[PDB]
Amino acid sequence: XXXXXXXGXXXXXXXXXXXXXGXXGXXXXXXXXXXXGXXXXXXXXXGXXXXXXXXXXXXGXXXXXXXXXXXXXXXXXXXXXXXXXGXXXXXXXXXXXXX
Amino acid sequence: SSVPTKLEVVAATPTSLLISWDAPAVTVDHYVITYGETGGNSPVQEFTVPGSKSTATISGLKPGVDYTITVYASDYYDGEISWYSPISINYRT
Ligand SMILES: [Cl-]
């Protein structure tokens, strides 16, 4: 677990430079490594970022669109961070993580 | 929007320079310091530095000539090496 926005593995350009100073919806997530169960997130907003990934199936739930989803992943990131259907908003802070 | 985020000449002689930068919170695989005359056509030199250092000495410069010093930082992850946006400065010895 951890919490605190995840922070698992790393990559994705060092998490966009640890969020690039922060703003918008912040972000977090992670994954990769030698597998890590898949992964994703990102975030940002005005100042860049993006990301995505997610996915899932095979009994394991998941999400990132697909008409909702679920089964873990912090309740799909707290329901998108409270909306944010296809990304493009939502989230709601995260960051830290060495910052 | 670069890694490292700061870059400075800390000390200077007519032929050498001491440069420092702010290391990032993430793991740098290794740095590449490049430098060449701002004129353009004059051969750009470069060398590498462990991802654990945040300083480097450049020597053998033409005194009085304006060079461009660039520092790149590498990310290594999932069997792939990749480069952050670099940082660069102009300095006149
Ligand atoms: Cl939470």
Numbering used by the authors:
A (entry chain A): 142 to 240
B (entry chain H): 6 to 98
Task: Provide the authors' original text about this structure.
Among the most commonly used non-immunoglobulin binders are monobodies (Mb), which are generated from large combinatorial libraries using a fibronectin III domain (FN3; ~10 kDa) of human fibronectin as molecular scaffold. Here, we develop monobodies with nanomolar binding affinities against the d-SH2 domain of the leukemic tyrosine kinase BCR::ABL1. Two crystal structures of heterochiral monobody-SH2 complexes reveal targeting of the pY binding pocket by an unconventional binding mode. In summary, monobody recognition is dominated by the FG loop of both monobodies that form a rippled β-sheet with the βD-strand of the SH2 domain, as well as ionic interactions between glutamate residues of the monobody and arginine residues of the SH2 domain.
We determined the crystal structures of the l-DAM21-d-Abl SH2 and l-DAM27-d-Abl SH2 complexes at 2.7 Å and 2.9 Å resolution, respectively. In both structures, we found the d-SH2 domain to be dimerized via a disulfide bridge of Cys198. Unlike those, DAM21/27 form a heterochiral anti-parallel β-sheet between strand Gly84 to Trp88/His88 in DAM21/27 of their FG loop with the βD-strand (Val190 to Arg194) of the d-Abl SH2 domain. The rippled β-sheet position Glu85 in the FG loop is inserted into the SH2 pY pocket, where it forms an ionic interaction with SH2 residue Arg171, which is part of the conserved FLVRES motif and makes the most critical interaction with the phosphate group in pY peptide ligands. In DAM21, FG loop residue Asp83 forms an additional ionic interaction with Arg194, unique in the Abl1 SH2 domain and therefore a possible contributor to selective Abl1 binding. To probe the functional roles of Asp83 and Glu85, we produced a D83A/E85A mutant in DAM21. ITC measurements showed no detectable binding, thus validating the critical role of these residues for SH2 domain binding and interface 2 as the biologically relevant protein interaction site. In DAM27, Tyr79 packs towards the β-hairpin and His88 is solvent exposed, whereas in DAM21, Trp88 is rotated inwards and would clash with large hydrophobic or aromatic residues at this position. Hence, Tyr79 is exchanged to Ser79 in DAM21. As observed in the DAM21 crystal structure, the monobody CD loop is not involved in Abl SH2 binding.
